């Protein structure tokens, strides 16, 4: 058989860039139907259409037992009162877990089961987050600077974006009165 070649890659903990990896870019215009305030969404697309996040992924052939890894640079910002976040997804193989390692900035993870129960975990540099089997996961930047992390996940986990794209998460993360709040999502069913 072919034994795949082990390698090291340099990851800059300040920028989240993985050398030689190749940027994927999600702009706000790529996230129609995600934010609670749709008029604020449309207005911010019209005015700027900012980058919400960039991902650098190092991925293997989809195979049981193997591992992918990726950094994300989640930029600071809000759509109305709602903080910039990642689209969020379940795994296609639902029981695949994930481990995140927060590197820079201030953020957190929203997680949700298929039954709709949600949980928020704060993330600051050094926080390692265990994303268990069956939990959808979205990251949120609650600060003024990029929120950068590294995620390691099974190479056969896949992605289910569609479920979240239609129903959302049952909780949202907003700023009111200069204070960060995690509250029920008024649009969730």
Ligand X SMILES: O=C(O)[C@@H](O)[C@H](O)[C@H](O)COP(=O)(O)O
Binding positions for Fe cation are: 89, 91, 98, 137
First to last CA, the chain: 50
Residue-wise over 169-178: b if at least 16 C-beta within 10 A, else e? Answer: bbbbbbeeee
Quote the least distance from Cβ 85 to ligand X, whole Å: 8
State how far the Cα of 76 lies from the Cα of 68, in Å rounded to an integer.
26
Q: What does 87 interact with, of Mn ion, ligand X, a second copy, none (CB < 5 to 8 A by kind)?
A: ligand X
Contact 89, 136 (CB under 8 A): yes
- Is residue 105 a contact residue for ligand X (CB under 6 A)? no
For ligand X, which is the closer residue by CB, 44 or 52? 52
Sole binder of a second copy in the list 44, 74, 79, 109 (CB under 8 A)? 109
Residue 137: which H helix or E strand, with range? strand 136-141
95 binds a second copy (CB under 8 A): yes
173 contacts ligand X (rule: CB under 6 A)? no
- The item of a second copy, ligand X, Mn ion, none sharing an interface with residue 40, based on CB under 5 to 8 Å by kind, is none
């Amino acid at each position: 058989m072919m034994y795949k070649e082990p390698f090291g890659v340099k990851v800059d903990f300040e920028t989240g860039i993985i050398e030689g990896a190749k940027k994927s870019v999600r702009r706000l215009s790529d996230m129609e139907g995600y934010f609670v305030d749709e008029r604020a969404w449309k207005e911010l697309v019209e005015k700027e259409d900012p980058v919400v996040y960039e991902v650098y992924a190092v991925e293997q052939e989809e195979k049981e037992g193997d591992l992918n890894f990726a950094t994300t640079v989640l930029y600071p910002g809000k759509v109305g009162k709602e903080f910039f976040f990642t689209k969020g997804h379940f795994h296609a193989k639902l029981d695949r877990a994930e481990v995140y390692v927060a590197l820079k900035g201030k953020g957190g993870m929203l997680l949700q089961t298929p039954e709709g129960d949600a949980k928020w975990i704060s993330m600051e540099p050094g926080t390692v987050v265990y994303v268990p089997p069956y939990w959808a996961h979205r990251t949120v930047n609650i600060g003024d600077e990029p929120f950068i992390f590294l995620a390691i996940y099974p190479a056969d986990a896949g992605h289910d974006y569609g479920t979240i794209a239609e129903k959302g998460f049952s909780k949202i993360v907003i700023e009111e009165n200069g204070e960060v709040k995690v509250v029920d999502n008024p649009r969730w069913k």
